Design a protein around this ligand. Sequence first.
Ligand SMILES: *CC(=O)N1CC[C@@]2(CCN(S(=O)(=O)c3ccc(Br)c(F)c3)C2)C1
Ligand SMILES: *CC(=O)N1CC[C@@]2(CCN(S(=O)(=O)c3ccc(Br)c(F)c3)C2)C1
Ligand SMILES: [Cl-]
Ligand SMILES: [Cl-]
Ligand SMILES: [Mg+2]
Ligand SMILES: [Mg+2]
Ligand SMILES: [Mg+2]
Ligand SMILES: [Mg+2]
Ligand SMILES: [Mg+2]
Ligand SMILES: [Mg+2]
Lengths: 231, 231, 10, 10
Amino acid sequence: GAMGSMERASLIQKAKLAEQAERYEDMAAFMKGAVEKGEELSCEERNLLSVAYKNVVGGQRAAWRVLSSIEQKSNEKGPEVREYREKVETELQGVCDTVLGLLDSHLIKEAGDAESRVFYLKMKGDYYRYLAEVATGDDKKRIIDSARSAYQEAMDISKKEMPPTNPIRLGLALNFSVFHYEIANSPEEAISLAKTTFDEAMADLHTLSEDSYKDSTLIMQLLRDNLTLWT
Amino acid sequence: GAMGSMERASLIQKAKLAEQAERYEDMAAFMKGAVEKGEELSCEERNLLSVAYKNVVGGQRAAWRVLSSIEQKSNEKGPEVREYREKVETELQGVCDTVLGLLDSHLIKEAGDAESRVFYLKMKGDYYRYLAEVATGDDKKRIIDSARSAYQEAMDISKKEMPPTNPIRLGLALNFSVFHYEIANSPEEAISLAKTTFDEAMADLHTLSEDSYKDSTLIMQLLRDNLTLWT
Amino acid sequence: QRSTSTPNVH
Amino acid sequence: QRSTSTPNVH
Ligand SMILES: *CC(=O)N1CC[C@@]2(CCN(S(=O)(=O)c3ccc(Br)c(F)c3)C2)C1
Ligand SMILES: *CC(=O)N1CC[C@@]2(CCN(S(=O)(=O)c3ccc(Br)c(F)c3)C2)C1
Ligand SMILES: [Cl-]
Ligand SMILES: [Cl-]
Ligand SMILES: [Mg+2]
Ligand SMILES: [Mg+2]
Ligand SMILES: [Mg+2]
Ligand SMILES: [Mg+2]
Ligand SMILES: [Mg+2]
Ligand SMILES: [Mg+2]
């Protein structure tokens, strides 16, 4: 709402300036305003949206992890650590709720190219996964199944529509395997997904694209890093 | 006001947790709430106040400098760069206004030990200096003289009350010399102040304190770095 | 050591 | 290159 008076092109421009200035909360607000104009986002613009919110929630996750570790050490004696961890947690959930709301209200569509559909469903899986990192009760079951369903729909599309070196397909599989290992407690599924993804990218390495091959080969290396850590 | 229901000790505790979590905006809010309890701040607690607000305004200054450079390059063609630079500038001024308000309303007193009086007057000089970095009109003259007067009062006290290796005295002189060089356009004053400060610390090096000598020797090296850059 | 997910780029 | 002011510590 705060962004409603600004032209879409100016919001994009300002998101790029905020990225340059390392003002990621501003850049997420600008991109939210751009999304709310109701037009599709290009691949460049999806990157801006992704970078902004990942930076914001990344700092919140890092803070939450620090506070949670302090909280668990102090349980192994006031309310302050728990109260402040709950504070940061509530802010993190709000950002994830904002992103998931934009995905549901504006971005996830039946139409569009494969890149966009896979990317947004991957994003939905990621931000449910971030909610799952801090969930506990009846909410936690609902969230974990929501993440898996979004990842699975993204995988079905990526395998049918995308070459096995496509960086969005690779990044999705990487993130789905992290979900399996860290969230779903399924190390076998995580390992087999990451190995299958790596091997299938290597078998069809000729499908690397001139405009994205550096991204593809980075994710391939991260798949191998996880496989080394998990084995 | 947001912090008024929390006990002072809990605010201090939470400021320390926020520092650990690299949540500096939270840690500044907690320390503002502690200051507003109306009791003096210890040397430990002044450090928490200092670290929090310096991190917050430091990120704003860094962002402002990025945007200002982009703005000046585009003047050597829409309003977006200027509008966003003005946005960040207004936020920076608000943080400086908040800090200066706390100094005037709560922290700067006639009583107290030399450390506290010098430290707060140094802080006042610093946050006026940060306002001067982004000022222009009739405001800019008022701000520059306010910074100088606060630094000068802090120097008079530090020279009378503190050994020449005291880290607050050193940090004040370092920051005053930066003021002279970068704000007041007086390189001669900056160089002579930094050289006098370094030489006088070296001449009375035996006054280093067991509990702060690492801080003193760090500032001494920074004085020499500036002297090398300025000569 | 945590697993590594997709990073930010560009 | 900017002049260096007092840094944050501890
Ligand atoms: C074209 C398009 O829709 N893109 C490409 C960039 C993004 C934003 C981030 N995703 S991603 O999460 O799939 C991803 C991030 C980093 C890397 Br190295 C990667 F290969 C994929 C793609 C928008
Ligand atoms: C005891 C006391 O009042 N102190 C010591 C710490 C502070 C917070 C920062 N100041 S400072 O700006 O004078 C300063 C910062 C860093 C360094 Br290495 C230094 F020597 C001085 C002192 C509160
Ligand atoms: Cl809290
Ligand atoms: Cl703006
Ligand atoms: Mg118009
Ligand atoms: Mg006990
Ligand atoms: Mg909660
Ligand atoms: Mg009480
Ligand atoms: Mg022109
Ligand atoms: Mg202004």
